[PDB]
Amino acid sequence: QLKNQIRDARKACADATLSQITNNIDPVGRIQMRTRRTLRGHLAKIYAMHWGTDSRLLVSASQDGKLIIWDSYTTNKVHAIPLRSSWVMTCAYAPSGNYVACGGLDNICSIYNLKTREGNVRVSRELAGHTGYLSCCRFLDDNQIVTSSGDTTCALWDIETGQQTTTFTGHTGDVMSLSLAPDTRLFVSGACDASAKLWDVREGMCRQTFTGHESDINAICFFPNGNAFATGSDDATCRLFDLRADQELMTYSHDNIICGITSVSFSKSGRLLLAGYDDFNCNVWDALKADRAGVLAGHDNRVSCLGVTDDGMAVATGSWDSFLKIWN
């Protein structure tokens, strides 16, 4: 009954789509980008990458038990942290550039400290409270972290104490991706249920649930405004959901793609979004006209991650080939 009421409320409020309002807007044209720099430091597949707040240092984690922090300007190596577990599924970088988290199949995403008096990387924290493979642990501040695991729960952990302060449950399938809003007050989690749920950190109870997909969703990223986000699924149909409207706005599909998506990212202004498919090609799509504004090649096997700098200068994309390409 309540679900039917929500369906009626969402359908009644819908009269026109963003396509009609964007009809008078001219196309963004062909955005041609070339790989300015190439980083070849890993020897196996890389599964995650995160940009720093200064758009200078980025950390990438591979399957050979190695995570490397590179200088995006001179393509120099400044830190390479060996790991006890060779299986790493996600990595995250601190806003202050002090801690780096990396996790994988093991039920722990370890946090390592970069700046130390001795000048050597050492283990800082090892959060072990989950039973399913950790999917993505993200930093909020110097004292808090969020973890999205394979147990269908999202846990808020305090680095200093090491114990989880809040737990979020309600998903049937394992949660895969997690992104933090600019204000660091609420986030969104997606699972195999083809739905995304908004979770408020301060209180710790769910707000809204969004549907529309038929398969599992792999990546979710907030719009820079913070009032909407984009989700990718294995059906090659990325969908943008608005929190305020509580309804899907537009669909992103094409007939030439049958493979799934891996990562979704937005730009500084949000005019153009980036998608990484399994066709070793990155798609740059207009967020307003629902058209394909660019195609990027140069990968062999599959695009695993992609991320735009906070300043919006360039975008770094990493595939299973172990080569990271910086488009600008």
Binding site: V78, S85, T131
Partner: protein, 219 residues
């Protein structure tokens, strides 16, 4: 160009690259094995008899050859989203218990379905499978005490231990769809310890030799 800090950073990067390459070369000479099976098929006992909370790593050294065995059955989740991470493994060691008729979750059909899913997975086209069968004494006692028609409605035959074992062996090897690329090695696990390790080593050596021959094009 005339920068000292830049040169120091370049030297540090060169040292890091040297260390990474050395570590990769050191770790490249290790044969990776993926252990799979049901919850109570004797995987822990098998690991114990070779060696004497998610991924469990075990190290074996036999006749100057390092084996890294990855046991994954400790944690239960959706296999479709993390199986691809195990691409390139030298061999998949699948463990099955012969005395599974008593308890019903039936485990025989579930094990067959799991084996079919794993073998026909698109990410293990060239990965060999080594099949281990456990608890022959319990199986023999059960066939002595109970018939075989309970688990096999569509099969009728003698109750001899050898014939039943051969039928099960053929049925398990029948599941695979592709036979030219991968070959299934099946062995009977016993109370002895050296035989299991010897069979594993022989299977790994045969797989490596066949891969090298295929690279040369002879095979």
């Amino acid at each position: 160009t005339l920068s000292a800090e830049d040169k120091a950073a370049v030297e540090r990067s060169k040292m890091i690259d040297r260390n990474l390459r050395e570590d990769g070369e050191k770790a490249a000479r290790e044969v990776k094995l993926l252990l799979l099976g049901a919850g109570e098929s004797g995987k822990n006992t098998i690991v114990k008899q070779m060696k004497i909370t998610g991924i469990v790593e075990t190290h074996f050294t036999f006749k100057d050859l390092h084996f890294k065995m990855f046991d994954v059955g400790a944690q239960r989740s959706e296999r479709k989203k993390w199986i691809h991470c195990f691409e390139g493994v030298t061999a998949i060691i699948f463990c099955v218990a012969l005395s599974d008729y008593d308890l019903v979750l039936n485990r025989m059909h579930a094990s067959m379905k799991l084996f079919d899913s794993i073998c026909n997975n698109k990410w293990f086209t060239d990965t060999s499978i080594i099949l281990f069968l456990n608890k022959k004494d319990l199986f023999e006692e059960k066939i002595k005490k109970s018939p075989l028609t309970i688990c096999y409605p569509e099969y009728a035959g003698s109750n001899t231990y050898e014939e039943a074992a051969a039928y099960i062996q053929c049925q398990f090897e029948d599941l695979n769809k592709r036979k030219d690329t991968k070959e299934i090695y099946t062995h009977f696990t016993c109370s002895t310890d050296t035989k299991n390790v010897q069979f594993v080593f022989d299977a790994v050596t045969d797989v490596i030799i066949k891969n090298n021959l295929k690279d040369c094009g002879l095979f």
